[PDB]
Write a structure and sequence with these properties.
CATH topology of the largest domain in chain A: D-amino Acid Aminotransferase, Chain A, domain 2
Helix content of chain A: 25-40%
GO molecular function (chain A): branched-chain-amino-acid transaminase activity; L-isoleucine-2-oxoglutarate transaminase activity; L-leucine-2-oxoglutarate transaminase activity; L-valine-2-oxoglutarate transaminase activity; pyridoxal phosphate binding
Number of domains of chain A: 2
Protein name (chain A): Branched-chain-amino-acid aminotransferase
Shape of chain A: globular
Subunit structure (chain A): Homodimer.
GO biological process, one term (chain A): isoleucine biosynthetic process
CATH superfamily of the largest domain in chain A: D-amino Acid Aminotransferase, subunit A, domain 2
CATH architecture of the largest domain in chain A: Alpha-Beta Barrel
Number of helices of chain A: 8
Largest sheet of chain A: 9 strands, mixed
Distance between the termini of chain A: 19 Å
CATH class of the largest domain in chain A: Alpha Beta
Bound molecules: ligand 7TS
Oligomer: homodimer
Family (chain A): Belongs to the class-IV pyridoxal-phosphate-dependent aminotransferase family.
Strand content of chain A: 25-35%
Structural class of chain A: alpha+beta
Largest interface: A-B, 60 and 60 residues
Radius of gyration of chain A: 20 Å
Chain lengths: 326, 328
Amino acid sequence: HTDHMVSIDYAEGRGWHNARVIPYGPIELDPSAIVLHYAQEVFEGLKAYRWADGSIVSFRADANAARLRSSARRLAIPELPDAVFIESLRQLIAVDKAWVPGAGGEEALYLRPFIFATEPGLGVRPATQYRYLLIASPAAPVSVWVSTEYVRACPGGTGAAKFGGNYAASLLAQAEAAENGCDQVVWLDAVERRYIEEMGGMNIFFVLGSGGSARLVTPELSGSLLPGITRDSLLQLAIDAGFAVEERRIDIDEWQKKAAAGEITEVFACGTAAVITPVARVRHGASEFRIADGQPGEVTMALRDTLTGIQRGTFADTHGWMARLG
Amino acid sequence: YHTDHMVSIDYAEGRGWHNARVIPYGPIELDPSAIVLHYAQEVFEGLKAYRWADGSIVSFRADANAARLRSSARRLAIPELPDAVFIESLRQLIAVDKAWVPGAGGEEALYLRPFIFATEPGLGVRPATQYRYLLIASPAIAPVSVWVSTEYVRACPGGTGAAKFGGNYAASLLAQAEAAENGCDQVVWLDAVERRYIEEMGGMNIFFVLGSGGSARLVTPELSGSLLPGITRDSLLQLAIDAGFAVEERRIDIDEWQKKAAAGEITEVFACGTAAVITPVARVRHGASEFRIADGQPGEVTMALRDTLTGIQRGTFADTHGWMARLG
Ligand SMILES: Cc1ncc(COP(=O)(O)O)c(CNc2co[nH]c2=O)c1O
Ligand SMILES: Cc1ncc(COP(=O)(O)O)c(CNc2co[nH]c2=O)c1O
């Protein structure tokens, strides 16, 4: 973690107030603070990048701001205004700027904005007191384990929110994966236990065919998986590069069948931390199957090169995704 | 409000659960990266301590809570707190804060809140290697109306609904607001997959009474894997059998509830749980539909069971099943 953190308080009637930059250090809670009992909390994640001209920039921070608000609404948490969200990013970079790594490769500074209920009380109801903190931390094909025993979120629930509870529910599967020598978990839909949703901390894309004829398929926003900002961006970039894209349902049977037939030629996972991570093989119960030759796919690495290029300030930001933080 | 003291126990991978100690009730500290603040790795319980006429403090089925906290812990990848350490923590707090247990023998008792949360600093999504357990205490039949949630779902099969886990409660807060907006006091939740089978209330299990007198049948949702196996629920099923009522655990459709209530087949409805013991349900809102349960008054079977269970917990009715045990 870096040297400082940004703290902001909420009190009913007063709104979000008392924003201040303080050292990174322990915080205090009443034993009956609602977050310790009923998990009323939401969070975000995004990076600060250093550019060649010496500036520090963010990638689609406005999207994170709005998503923290969408998550907060689902959890009955008062929304942090986008302007205050953005300003907290600027405040932290101003004091901890030396922590942002050099330009220009994979290295960046990870920013963790988060909100938790602090009001003391064992009644099960939305809190009237909260805290927001902003902290910072300095920041290869994988195998995936299909979870059949566990479900992470369901329609009408909290899966489209970045809510701590979704991650808690995933811990046992994430241990069961490692016990099968897999790197990550792919989650299936709650209702029919068939349709691909997402991985534990990433969205998932499928490449079908190859060359100019190659096209992208990704699970549609079901209501129970996260609308990732990397996912959103890659949809836009694929369209920019002339790839057909389909947001639709795809189940594990279609995945296995089309991979075996060689129609699915690449699979990749995407998210803020790794940008894009190739998926080489899949374990589904007793069976295992490989994606193509198990190596990083052509479209996979082309999209990754485009997106990291924009983020590092090497390639034109045609969508106006980058903004200055310091 | 809270009593004077709390019990604190730490978990670390070399020591396991250790350093159990009675300390004043007061603020606790967490690293900003403590896993509970990001990924909600936490579970909890709730039970009461009762003062009896003879001066003793007793627990009701505290062994059941000890085991359920372990079951909850297991589902949330939390190292289990041994049952003996759980029971001892109840005894430790009652020993110093006994004077806080209210007088015998009405509705008043001392509510106990055992709870575990992840304290290890780290932003990696993995089970914590460090936890804290706290035990805190807090001093503790009007019919209610219920709103059937059709828009929100509280837990998923394959999920965490059979565990007493903070995240189930977090997920439920938005629906509880829609209920108030429609005049109702509590929320009834339906199953995730088919959006039609009755699960439970936000903090209580639900029962239906069919018919009347000795031939009445007590009906309750079967354990689905996504609703909480309430200890009050478990006890009332036994008490119903003791009394000679037929009991049925099964899947019950929401469209069956209103239909049988309107036909006079469902004669009573109630909710049960640690805090209120039994709360009669008078009225139900489901979408546009609204229906009443009989005359809206507490039902005969409802109050017979409530009187028996409260009687056992206050020591005035014979404890045939050995549910009551000395705390201090
Ligand atoms: C469940 C889940 N799905 C998808 C994603 C990808 O979302 P994106 O990053 O906005 O593209 C994340 C990562 N979300 C996080 C982003 O930064 N830290 C995170 O935990 C996630 O936790
Ligand atoms: C979702 C849910 N279902 C059912 C119940 C009833 O469970 P029982 O009390 O064991 O009969 C509770 C209350 N659980 C609590 C028991 O004490 N404090 C509580 O929050 C609950 O929170």
